[PDB]
Amino acid sequence: GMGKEIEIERKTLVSKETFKRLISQLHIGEGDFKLQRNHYFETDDFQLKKQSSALRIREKEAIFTFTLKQPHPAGLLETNQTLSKQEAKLALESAHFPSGEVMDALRDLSIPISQLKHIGTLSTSRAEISYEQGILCLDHSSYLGIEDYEIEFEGTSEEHATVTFQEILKTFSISQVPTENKIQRFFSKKE
Ligand SMILES: [Cl-]
Prior knowledge:
By secondary structure, the chain is an alpha+beta fold. Helices cover about 30% and strands about 40% of the residues.
């Protein structure tokens, strides 16, 4: 919707060689990959994690986006807000966030905004294609000295997303493995 959206997502990590094979078989060019930086925010005691939520500022092609992800009956509720470079920099450098729908949703979750701070940055090189009735993302990410590769399917219903993703794993012979979110893979490494 207009700032808010429901995220229905299926995901698995893959090897470097499998990722490289998928780029070839899906006929994805080098120029299709776009670079983005995810700057993560969290309290010392990890309050957003305890409420199954994630707060980031994304930087992509000179556009900054403030994003909260929180639990929702179906999938996760994603609340997006555009920021200027000024607002993004203030948040990153001095933990001063702008008023708006993201701030409102944080305060509705009883998150002390004065305790939030920039914990680190994960970079992702991403290619996206329309697959069936959804979107298929190829993510090569780097963070805290290491890197990894990931395929994800963005669906519209939980039922159809499962069917479509299981079809992708079978069709392209991808062996599925347990896969937590980028932000969780980030600070599980940080810990
Ligand atoms: Cl990267």
